[PDB]
């Protein structure tokens, strides 16, 4: 879903203001006991008919003078009292009859149009909290003392106004006849807050709303803007969060503008509730919010970096004997928009791509992700040092990166970046205008017993944006991926100029699934099929599949799974469910025996003929269960560079067998061999892994070129200045003791 | 204009208060609230009585009823009409009082806004001179404590001031509401915040920490390298904060009139408060503060190793030196301000002038050889004002001599017979390839003031040169403003304050010396007003009679749009600026050189192609040529020989096979220094009747030393190039000097 910028928020507000401004509510204290309507109506009814009858008697003459006086004095006493009562009863009847109807519908609308705006910035309470957790002048201290009073009041009054307008009864009928203590107390609580928000005194709402802006723009003696002060704290960050300086600051800018935007809306709302003269705050609101933008655009922004890096790290051991190739390539029309290294199921690099909109924005609907597995074998070594070619690859303005390739050969990691020309006006990428750069100047990390600190977390901008730079840095034995975003260029065409703005926020998790209708929201479950009225959709805020007794939901997904590959299952579940990936032959995946009070997320992986499997949500034994966000995604297998040996070129001999995964198992007295040819002028590298005990040899027509006993280890050996003579072959054998096993794997000879 | 001190501001306020206090509106014993309340009450009784007398009237005139009864009903109709008449009496009085009041009030608010705008200009200068400080700040607990203690009161006062200004600049409910809030008697009143502001300012606050004291600390925190002295910076602060409350009290007086309350003369209290802040300043803070001031910035520049410059800042007879500014505009430039003195070290605005000296980089900095800097903190005794400063650099050895005359604060006459002279133990900076940090920025007091100290400092570590002076600001504040006597302070100018261009600062419609041609050219009121052109519209001004031949001038203007600026003559252009497009006003700074005959040149402001354009602040000022000490060689004493020619600028060009020579005489007992510059390839030699005393092949700036040499007879220096035809060798800055 798109975040439509500050311009977007601020207009959304202006609209609601208009809607309020054009409500007419036709003279009340709003301290009238509305519960007293029946009491007063009765007293009124009775007094009226008595004064009526007594009145008729006086005006039918025929009455002694002195007496006709006393009866008149008794008519005035009575009339005063009826007048005074009908006062109260008029106020009560107009509050119920004119006022409440016009107000309850106006509050109702405000709550609705405000819910819509609060969603557009929901993302950002979690993306701003990420910062304060990871935070530790007089100019700094000064804007804290200057702002926090105003910040606390505004925030409180905003949240409390929202909370009260959402829980006042909107059915004006509900306020008549049998109104409840609770229904009246919600309306009073609102009118009281209204009275406090609008009271003209030295501690006024308007005063705090003004001083908030004065501090935001630096009209405050020191000339220290809060944007300026916040900016400082972010740039001098000792431990970092996702996004670039620009992003983080623009995030701050959004939160703070949004706050005042709603301050002004709250104020407008409270004025109608109290029936004061209508003020168009829109002009002032816009002037204020516009000034914060210009102060940002002019004084802060040009000092900020558009670099962004992995926020966390992770200690991981890689492979010393693998030569992996990892290729993140967008499709023709698409561009690379960001990454996330994670390690929950296993070390995984997720790569997001999408088609571009004008001015470096992203097309939501056109947006996709791919998972790459075992990146620990790419990034980290285990026992030997790894060389890291370092190059800060940067393309010229108008280029967006569309492909990144990682190559690790003999513990030497390098990368090559490809970028295509993009036009901000149309947002078309030009597939003929390509530029390519790759990684002489390097850094090398020595392997620790414990591991090395590989990158971790989301490598992206705060708002997903195509990129024009990319590079790997090394330290602490720590590897850092960094990219350069187009967020600046995107903010200056769209939102810092008050044009339409279409920003996506960097996703927290997975955004796709092979499961159709993986995110339940409405009643319709689309591809999910129910069976009983035992299975239904529960509206748990965000909706959820529900089962009880034996109620099940199914979705057939065979066409979509490929054989002998690893997938990731993740779901968000509550209660005590049973989840299956079943085939009438076999079960591929099962989760029962899970009990939860509340919604958690569960993350697992799963792996000869996994076609014609359907997926099943039930409940265990006889209990209830909820669940959705059913992610199943392919974990692309790690691919490696070519080598000299070939898997079908191995010759078996005796009690041996070749299992699946390039493994060569010696079951007794047998052995494997493969013919190879070695040249005098070349340096070769033998690497392999063994579980068990055995011997590697390379023999010749005349001589051994290599002989090594081995036991449960990764092996590396170098061969130099060697020339084989006729038939030459490597041979793998175990110890010849029967009913034992020796399993070789990842056997490779590579010419340097 | 002059800034007339705190006493000046505070009286200006008192005046406006008086003007309000003496506005006579409807002098009704009742408030504004009581008039609009009574208006409604009477309007309603009138409304109702009317419809009753209406109904009773209709009953009588429906006849058909007994004569005797029709009488009694009529008598009851008269009583009723009398009562409506007597009520409308009251309601007329109320409506006519309101008809007097709003007119009397709206004109009084209008006037207040006007007289307040005039005062806010007298302190406009110092939001920019105070901003200069916060930029250069970066923490006590004593500081943090007085922030938390004052900001509550500061915020509301500021708010109520600004909001009152915004609401009167647009005239009425919004105003009466603010009025009601400002005047409400409750524990948390405006008056409460106004009082606690003062309590914090003077330290009548239990522990006894004045904010003046705590602010003073922060300013004198030795990290604060901005223009002016500690005194100035603190007194600036003092001005801002007093001024704030001054207007707090004015706003309060205004709001009370608006509400029609009894008139209170806040003037006595306002003055007591502002007086206390002064005494607290004069007694407890001031005597701890320095009157030193230095260049706030630095600049990396390369100078000359081979120039021997003399730079002389000399005030005229009646005048005194008031401050300087080094800048890096068209070139390294030292600007010097002078003026005639008023009593107590104040300055005579109208009598005030500036002079630009060029290439001070050749004075201050070396290029390839070390420079020696004689350092002396020259200081004269009280009553002396500096009237002349001379800089002499000889063979990379910079020195200075200061002259001061006796001044009388009572009259403000300078005594031309009572002079004192002091001049310049040294420090030497080695030349970096990159340059040396020469001083940069305005060397002056916050308020321009004559000076009694001056000196140059050097920082060896940083290769940095610092000019410092000692102001008379203390002595000037104590006679005038810290005593509530008339005060006449000028604020240190931000830029240039003069121009050869007449009416260089457009403000009114009249453009004086500027002549328009079409209604295509007019004055736009862009806040500060601005020349405007469209289509072909042009503005011109003759300036030939101002320009001198073969000299460098500085042009600077503040322009918007895409205009065209010319220093034209029929058939020749001396200076042009087209191809400049701007969204907003910038300032542009260039130099130019008048021609061989730059008379009969006039200035032109147009627009380029066919666009619009704005501009003013048209500065054109002479860049005094750098002058050097005497040397042994003379420009007319050069003898030419062959394919050579002497160009303008002391250059000697060898065009082919020729050469230059000049006869000189060298003595055994003396050390000589040969220096020169060459573009090209060549040979310098000094020959004799018997001997070469010097021979050097040379694209280079060169220094050579000659010792223990006695020219036998008829010895001359000779400059020659390579003898290859259709090539050039250009010598320049050729000098021999006896040490």
Protein model, in words:
- This is part of a larger assembly, with two copies of chain A.
- Chain A has 752 residues and is an alpha+beta fold.
- Chain A is built from twelve helices and 34 strands.
- In chain A, a hairpin with a 4-residue loop joins strand 14 (467-474) and strand 15 (479-485).
- In chain A, helix 5 crosses helix 8, helix 5 crosses helix 9 (245-273) and helix 7 (205-217) runs antiparallel to helix 9 (245-273).
- The interface between A and B is medium-sized, with 22 and 34 residues.
Concise summary:
The structure is cut from a larger assembly and holds 2 copies of chain A. Chain A has 752 residues and is an alpha+beta fold. Chain A has 12 helices and 34 strands.
Secondary structure layout:
The structure is cut from a larger assembly and holds two copies of chain A.
Chain A (H helix, E strand, L loop, with lengths): L4 H17 L15 H22 L6 H56 L2 H10 L5 H28 L15 H18 L6 H13 L8 H10 L9 H29 L8 H19 L6 E3 L2 E5 L7 E6 L4 E9 L5 E10 L3 E13 L1 H5 L6 E4 L2 E3 L4 E11 L2 E11 L6 E10 L3 E4 L6 E8 L7 E8 L4 E7 L1 H7 L35 E2 L4 E4 L5 E4 L5 E4 L10 E9 L1 E6 L4 E5 L4 E11 L7 E6 L5 E12 L2 E2 L10 E3 L2 E4 L3 E4 L4 E5 L8 E16 L4 E16 L9 E6 L7 E10 L1
Parallel strand pairs in A: 6-25, 7-10
Antiparallel strand pairs in A: 1-15, 2-13, 3-9, 3-26, 4-5, 4-13, 5-6, 7-12, 8-14, 9-10, 10-11, 14-15, 16-19, 17-18, 18-25, 19-24, 20-23, 20-25, 21-22, 21-24, 27-30, 28-29, 29-34, 30-33, 31-32, 31-33, 31-34
Helix pairs in contact in A: 1-3, 1-9, 1-10, 2-3, 4-9, 5-6, 5-7, 5-8, 5-9, 6-9, 7-9, 8-9, 9-10
């Amino acid at each position: 879903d798109y975040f439509n910028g500050i311009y977007g928020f601020a207009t959304g507000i202006k609209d609601i203001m208009g809607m309020i401004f054009k409500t007419d509510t036709g003279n009340l204290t709003l301290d009238e006991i509305l519960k007293n309507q029946n009491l007063l109506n009765d007293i009124s009814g009775k007094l009226d008919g008595i004064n009526g009858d007594l009145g008729d008697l006086i005006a039918q003459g025929n009455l002694n003078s002195e007496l006709a006086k006393e009866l008149l004095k008794i008519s005035n006493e009575q009339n005063q009292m009826l007048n005074h009562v009908n006062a109260q009863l008029n106020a009560i009847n107009s509050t119920l009859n004119i006022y409440l109807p016009k107000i309850t519908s106006m509050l109702n609308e405000v709550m609705k149009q405000n819910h819509v705006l609060s969603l557009q910035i929901e993302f950002l309470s979690k993306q701003l909290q990420e910062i304060s957790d990871k935070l530790d002048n007089v100019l700094i201290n000064s804007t804290l003392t200057e702002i926090t009073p105003a910040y606390q009041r505004i925030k409180y009054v905003n949240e409390k106004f929202d909370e009260l307008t959402s829980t006042v009864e909107k059915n004006p009928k509900s306020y008549q006849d049998n109104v409840t203590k609770e229904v009246i107390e919600n309306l009073n609580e609102l009118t009281e807050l209204a009275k406090s928000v609008t009271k003209n005194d030295m501690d006024s709402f308007e005063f705090y709303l003004q001083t908030f802006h004065d501090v935001m723009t630096g009209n405050n003696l020191f000339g220290r803007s809060a944007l300026k002060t916040a900016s400082e704290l972010i740039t001098k960050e000792n431990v970092t969060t996702r996004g670039s300086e620009i992003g983080k600051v623009y995030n701050f800018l959004i939160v703070l503008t949004s706050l005042q935007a709603k301050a002004f809306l709250t104020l407008t709302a409270c004025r109608k509730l109290l029936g004061l003269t209508d003020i168009d705050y829109t002009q002032i609101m816009n002037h204020h919010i516009d000034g914060q933008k210009r102060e940002f655009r002019i004084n802060i922004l040009p000092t900020l970096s558009n670099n962004f890096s992995n926020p966390s790290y992770s200690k991981n051991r890689g492979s010393d004997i693998d030569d992996p190739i990892v290729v993140l390539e967008a499709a023709p029309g698409y561009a690379l928009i960001g990454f996330e290294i994670l390690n929950d199921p296993l070390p995984i690099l997720k790569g997001y791509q999408a088609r571009l909109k004008p001015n470096y924005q992203v097309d939501r609907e056109s947006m996709s992700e791919t998972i790459y597995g075992d990146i620990h074998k790419l990034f980290c070594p285990k026992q030997l040092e790894q060389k890291y070619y370092i190059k800060d690859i940067e393309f010229p303005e108008g280029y967006v990166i569309t492909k990144i390739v990682f190559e690790k050969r003999l513990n030497q990691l390098g990368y090559e970046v490809t970028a295509n020309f993009y036009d901000p006006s149309t947002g078309s990428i030009d597939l003929n205008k390509v530029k390519v750069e790759s990684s002489d100047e390097y850094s090398i990390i020595k392997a620790e017993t414990d591991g090395i600190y590989m990158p971790l977390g989301v490598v992206s901008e705060t708002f997903l944006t195509p990129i024009y730079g990319f590079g790997l840095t090394v330290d602490n034995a720590a590897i850092t991926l960094t990219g350069k975003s187009y967020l600046r260029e995107s903010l200056l065409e769209t939102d810092l100029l008050n044009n339409e703005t279409y920003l996506i926020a960097s996703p927290d998790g997975y955004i796709s699934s092979i499961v159709e209708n993986w995110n339940i929201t409405s009643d319709n479950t689309g591809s999910w099929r129910a069976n009983n009225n035992n299975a239904f959709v529960d509206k748990a805020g965000s909706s959820s599949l529900y089962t009880h007794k034996d109620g099940e939901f199914s979705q057939f997904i065979g066409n979509k799974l490929k054989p002998k590959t690893n997938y990731v299952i993740q779901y968000v579940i509550k209660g005590r469910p049973a989840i299956y990936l079943k085939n009438n032959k076999d079960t591929l995946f099962e989760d029962t025996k899970n009990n939860f009070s509340d919604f958690q997320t569960v993350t697992k992986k799963f792996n000869v003929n996994p076609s014609e499997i359907y997926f099943l949500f039930k409940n265990q034994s006889e209990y209830e269960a909820w669940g959705n966000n059913f992610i199943i995604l392919e974990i692309k297998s790690l691919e490696f560079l070519p080598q000299m040996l070939k898997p079908e070129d191995w010759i078996p001999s005796g009690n041996v067998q070749m299992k699946d995964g390039g493994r060569l198992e010696i079951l007794g007295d047998g052995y494997f061999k493969q013919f190879i040819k070695l040249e005098n002028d070349s340096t070769y590298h033998l690497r392999l892994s063994v579980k068990g005990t055995g011997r590697v040899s390379i023999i010749d027509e005349s001589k051994y070129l290599l002989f090594v006993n081995v036991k449960d280890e990764d092996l590396t050996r170098v061969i130099k200045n060697t020339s084989s003579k006729g038939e030459c072959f490597i041979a793998l054998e175990g110890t010849y003791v029967e009913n034992s096993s020796t399993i070789f794997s990842n056997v490779s000879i590579v010419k340097e």
